[PDB]
Design a protein around this ligand. Structure first.
Ligand SMILES: C=CC1=C(C)/C(=C/c2[nH]c(/C=C3N=C(/C=C4\NC(=O)C(C)=C4C=C)C(C)=C\3CCC(=O)O)c(CCC(=O)O)c2C)NC1=O
Ligand SMILES: *[C@@H]1O[C@H](CO)[C@@H](O[C@@H]2O[C@H](CO)[C@@H](O)[C@H](O)[C@H]2NC(C)=O)[C@H](O)[C@H]1NC(C)=O
Ligand SMILES: CCCCC/C=C\C/C=C\CCCCCCCC(=O)O
Ligand SMILES: *[C@@H]1O[C@H](CO)[C@@H](O)[C@H](O)[C@H]1NC(C)=O
Ligand SMILES: *[C@@H]1O[C@H](CO)[C@@H](O)[C@H](O)[C@H]1NC(C)=O
Ligand SMILES: *[C@@H]1O[C@H](CO)[C@@H](O)[C@H](O)[C@H]1NC(C)=O
Ligand SMILES: *[C@@H]1O[C@H](CO)[C@@H](O)[C@H](O)[C@H]1NC(C)=O
Ligand SMILES: *[C@@H]1O[C@H](CO)[C@@H](O)[C@H](O)[C@H]1NC(C)=O
Ligand SMILES: *[C@@H]1O[C@H](CO)[C@@H](O)[C@H](O)[C@H]1NC(C)=O
Ligand SMILES: *[C@@H]1O[C@H](CO)[C@@H](O)[C@H](O)[C@H]1NC(C)=O
Ligand SMILES: *[C@@H]1O[C@H](CO)[C@@H](O)[C@H](O)[C@H]1NC(C)=O
Ligand SMILES: *[C@@H]1O[C@H](CO)[C@@H](O)[C@H](O)[C@H]1NC(C)=O
Ligand SMILES: *[C@@H]1O[C@H](CO)[C@@H](O)[C@H](O)[C@H]1NC(C)=O
Lengths: 291, 336, 49, 50, 50, 50
């Protein structure tokens, strides 16, 4: 059971600059006070990352089926937990296996399964009448699920999914990549207070999980939640206002990087070899300063 | 006559210790090798093995394996190691196709059904199952992908059943001329050739000595000792040196620390969750002051970087004198 | 020391990598927080006479 | 010279302990020979520069 | 004057041994062969190692 | 120096593309490592003579 969304106001894809974002620990080995060079699928510095923001003031709720070019850097700025999952795959129409990551307000569920995904899946919240509070009332993702070869359901939990007013209080960064039948997810949650594009700074993404899905992924899309209440008119396809969350998508490319592990073993800085002549000299001389 | 630099001061290991994770369950050999219904090669079954002991001597009693080929590790060291994340990929294939389950192979099984990497650490085990998977009239339960547009990537699975278009005319989802069903069923019969008999194959894939581990060999752990040069064995990582308390805070996913030289300097003790620093127990230059061997057989020894004001010397003897160059043993100081 | 004024200035104006030659095993074993390069050199057989 | 101890030199690893723990002396000796050759080469380069 | 597709063999041919020298099997799709000869005969199984 | 690029140094060939075309990443890594070590030694010899 699924329903399309009709109140759509779309614009061209906004672009913004990745200010030295999207760096992850390349291995599970403790290194401290050392300059380490590694070549891997890294997000190039100052790359064009596409920006999708879901707000009501305009009624935009964008969620296209973006490509998955051998790795993706996702980054969600939000305060009310609108972004609550992704769908990865190759066709997303039950002809092939597809990966679903979902956080349905009680568990984080991961399923590698032949899903018959809907055109515009969503995770509609509604203001319930049994008690005057904000909780999950709709799970509109897929119509069928067969030949289902993975399951990683977590323990139950509870999360405050109320729509708040103010600046974005959380920045959750993810790096997904599909290598040798392994879906590697690196994650980093950082608290920020901003209402604009990606913050300046540096945060190394620690490894989160190394799922053995063993499927072919070339496209993906984000699963957004839909803020529904009695203060808006219309039917299911129109009685709804989007949250106030934004996310950014960049594409990893094969790059050489020079990382700096500090005394406590956290990557505090990095240099993108092959970004510009200055970084090229830093790469050649194996140092973060040049005389 | 002269002063000659000899090998630096060496301390031999007093004892050996072994620290393996605290686990006692035997790994599910029965649920992997003894399973009643193995999967098809095109849809191969991957099982995760964790928190158990890989004794693997129970298999000697009952099972005998036609092929057992290990890559990235010798067969003899499996008892002395522990494995970080272990996956058993099980399926059934033709007898002639067992050779295709290996790194850098080509063929229908290696291309369209089950590809292996060459950056592959693990072991491939195969054994005949003619008495189990073969029945009179043909056991057509085991299928394999015969047609695919392109070769599979390593450890990739493709369970689709879309009609394969070989020619130019689209198939439109139905069979026909140049439109074949991609999967074909093995015909296994008991009175049938050895090369075309069913073989059960299990590929165990894992990593070694890079991350925390929960599947470990049958080695027996030993009590931990600090501040003494010992022959340690931390999660299958052997070596020698002195273990001391550490101020380093490893992340939950980190097991070992490493230098600019790539040698291990810190390790998280698997039994008790603490970080121990490893320091080599050989340190400090040594020189031999000698007159000509014709003149005399006496010698003095200069131990650099030791204070002689349980010393790190071969023999204290007598006439121990502290010079700015180090501790001179065997020479008498004179004020002149 | 019997250094003159100019010799003192010259000595203070150039910093020596070693700063002495008696670096005992206990010292390199105790300074696990700080990674001096001399300790690594000595542990890898590279001594400065 | 200290930093050049982190080179495989064609061996499976740059650490003797990893080679000796993964491989027995059967196949470990060729890897250790490659490491010895490379490290001796590094020492010879250092001595020539000196 | 060939196109060495060799996927037509998968349908009905099953080879007990297939060992290649000087070439990786995975690269046999990517190459062109200059002076190709096929030397055909029959032996017993125990001699296939020879 | 340029002429010294025409040496196998124990590899199957002195051409990197030839190795990468015959062998795959499976086996080409060891051959490329041998070539890298040999050419690095040649560069070291040139720098020492200089
Ligand atoms: C999408 C899959 C998903 C991932 C990868 C995930 C990882 C994850 N979530 C965490 C907590 C947490 N997880 C969330 C919520 C979220 N975290 C997110 O990645 C997203 C998209 C939301 C929004 C629904 C919050 C808010 C915390 C911290 C609790 C708090 O401070 O309120 C933690 C810290 C460890 C812990 O939970 O104790 C991890 C590793 N949780 C998930 O649901
Ligand atoms: C993974 O999925 C993509 C898309 O299904 C495959 O790429 C296609 O391959 C066929 C081969 O004929 C082409 O006709 C298509 O044009 C390709 N589409 C795209 C977007 O690339 C790809 O082959 C699959 N990978 C594997 C190993 O099977
Ligand atoms: C008429 C013969 C022409 C041969 C042309 C020369 C080279 C072509 C490369 C290989 C030919 C042999 C392929 C055997 C099929 C794969 C067997 C398997 O592993 O399942
Ligand atoms: C509208 O929904 C139906 C099924 O719910 C779907 O088939 C259709 O494609 C959707 N409309 C568009 C333009 O996709
Ligand atoms: C890509 O990045 C460059 C530099 O930031 C910028 O000039 C260009 O406009 C970006 N591409 C698009 C479509 O905006
Ligand atoms: C959705 O949340 C419910 C509890 O509210 C939970 O039982 C269920 O596991 C979640 N969905 C999935 C697919 O697990
Ligand atoms: C896939 O699903 C279809 C129908 O549910 C079924 O016929 C087929 O056997 C399934 N294949 C596998 C490998 O599960
Ligand atoms: C490193 O950790 C110590 C405590 O273990 C702390 O005192 C210090 O402030 C930290 N320094 C940095 C740069 O994080
Ligand atoms: C495997 O099955 C056989 C036959 O039932 C049995 O004799 C043997 O003990 C089993 N081995 C294990 C490890 O369970
Ligand atoms: C290890 O196991 C033994 C027996 O179960 C137990 O006595 C001991 O407390 C355990 N040690 C730790 C650190 O868990
Ligand atoms: C060693 O001593 C003897 C005297 O007994 C002398 O004949 C000889 O020349 C000496 N040799 C050297 C190398 O000093
Ligand atoms: C250690 O050696 C130095 C230099 O010889 C000396 O000054 C110092 O007194 C020695 N330590 C003690 C306790 O004597
Ligand atoms: C040598 O000098 C020291 C102090 O100057 C003195 O204590 C010692 O007795 C003297 N020894 C001899 C043999 O003169």
């Amino acid at each position: 059971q699924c329903v399309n969304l009709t109140t759509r106001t779309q614009l061209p894809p906004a672009y913004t600059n990745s200010f030295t974002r999207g760096v992850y620990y390349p291995d599970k080995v403790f290194r401290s006070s050392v300059l380490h060079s590694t070549q891997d699928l890294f997000l190039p510095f100052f790359s064009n990352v596409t920006w999708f923001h879901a707000i009501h003031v305009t009624k935009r709720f964008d969620n296209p089926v973006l490509p998955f070019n051998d790795g993706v850097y996702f980054a969600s700025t939000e305060k009310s937990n609108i972004i609550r999952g992704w769908i990865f795959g190759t066709t997303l129409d039950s002809k092939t296996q597809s990966l679903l990551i979902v956080n349905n307000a009680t568990n984080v569920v991961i399923k590698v399964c032949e899903f018959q995904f809907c055109n515009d899946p969503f995770l509609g919240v509604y203001y319930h009448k049994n008690n005057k509070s904000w909780m999950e009332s709709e799970f509109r993702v897929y119509s069928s699920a067969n030949n289902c070869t993975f399951e990683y359901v977590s323990q139950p939990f509870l999360m405050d999914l109320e729509g708040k007013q103010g600046n974005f209080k959380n920045l959750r960064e993810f790096v997904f990549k599909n290598i040798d039948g392994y879906f590697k997810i690196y994650s980093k949650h950082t608290p920020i207070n901003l209402v604009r594009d990606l913050p300046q700074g540096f945060s190394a993404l620690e490894p989160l999980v190394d799922l053995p899905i063993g499927i072919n992924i070339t496209r993906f899309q984000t699963l957004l939640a839909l803020h529904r209440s009695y203060l808006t008119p219309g039917d299911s396809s129109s009685g709804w206002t989007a949250g106030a969350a934004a996310y950014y998508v960049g594409y990893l490319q094969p790059r050489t990087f020079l990382l700096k592990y500090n005394e406590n073993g956290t990557i505090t800085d990095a240099v993108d070899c092959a970004l510009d002549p200055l970084s090229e000299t830093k790469c050649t001389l194996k140092s973060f300063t040049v005389e | 006559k002269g002063i000659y630099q000899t090998s630096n001061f060496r301390v031999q290991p007093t004892e050996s210790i072994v620290r393996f994770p605290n686990i006692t369950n035997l790994c599910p050999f029965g649920e992997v090798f003894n399973a009643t219904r193995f999967a098809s090669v095109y849809a191969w079954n991957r099982k995760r093995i964790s928190n158990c002991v890989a004794d693997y001597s129970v298999l000697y009693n009952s099972a005998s394996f036609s092929t057992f080929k290990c890559y990235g590790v010798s067969p003899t060291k499996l008892n002395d190691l522990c494995f970080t994340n272990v996956y058993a990929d099980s399926f059934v294939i033709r007898g002639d196709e067992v050779r295709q389950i290996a790194p850098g192979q080509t063929g229908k099984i290696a291309d369209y059904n089950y590809k292996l990497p060459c950056d592959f650490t693990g072991c491939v085990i195969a054994w005949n199952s003619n008495n189990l998977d073969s029945k009179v009239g043909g056991n057509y339960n085991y299928l394999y992908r015969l047609f695919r547009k392109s070769n599979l990537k390593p450890f990739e699975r493709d369970i689709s059943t879309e009609i394969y278009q070989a020619g130019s005319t689209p198939c439109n989802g139905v069979e026909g001329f140049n439109c074949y069903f991609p999967l074909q069923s093995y015909g296994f019969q008991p009175t049938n050739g050895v090369g075309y008999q069913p073989y059960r194959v299990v590929v165990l894939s894992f990593e070694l000595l890079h991350a925390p581990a929960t599947v470990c060999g049958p080695k027996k752990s030993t009590n931990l000792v600090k501040n003494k040069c010992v022959n340690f064995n931390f999660n299958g990582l052997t070596g020698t040196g002195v273990l001391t308390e550490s101020n380093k805070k490893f992340l939950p996913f980190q097991q070992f620390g490493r230098d600019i030289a790539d040698t291990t300097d810190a390790v998280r003790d698997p039994q008790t969750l603490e970080i121990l620093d490893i320091t080599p127990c050989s340190f400090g230059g040594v020189s031999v002051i000698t007159p000509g061997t014709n003149t005399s057989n006496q010698v003095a020894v200069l131990y650099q970087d030791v204070n002689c004001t349980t010393w790190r010397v071969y023999s204290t003897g007598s006439n121990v004198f502290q010079t700015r160059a180090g501790c001179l043993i065997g020479a008498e100081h004179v004020n002149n | 020391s019997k250094r003159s004024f100019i010799e003192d200035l010259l000595f203070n104006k150039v910093t020596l990598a070693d700063a002495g030659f008696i670096k005992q095993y206990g010292d390199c074993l105790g300074d696990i927080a700080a990674r001096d390069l001399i300790c690594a050199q000595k542990f890898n057989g590279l001594t400065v006479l | 010279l200290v930093k050049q101890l982190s080179s495989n030199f064609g061996a499976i690893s740059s650490v003797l302990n990893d080679i000796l723990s993964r491989l027995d002396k059967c196949e470990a000796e060729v890897q250790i020979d490659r490491l010895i050759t490379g490290r001796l080469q590094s020492l010879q380069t250092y001595v020539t520069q000196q």
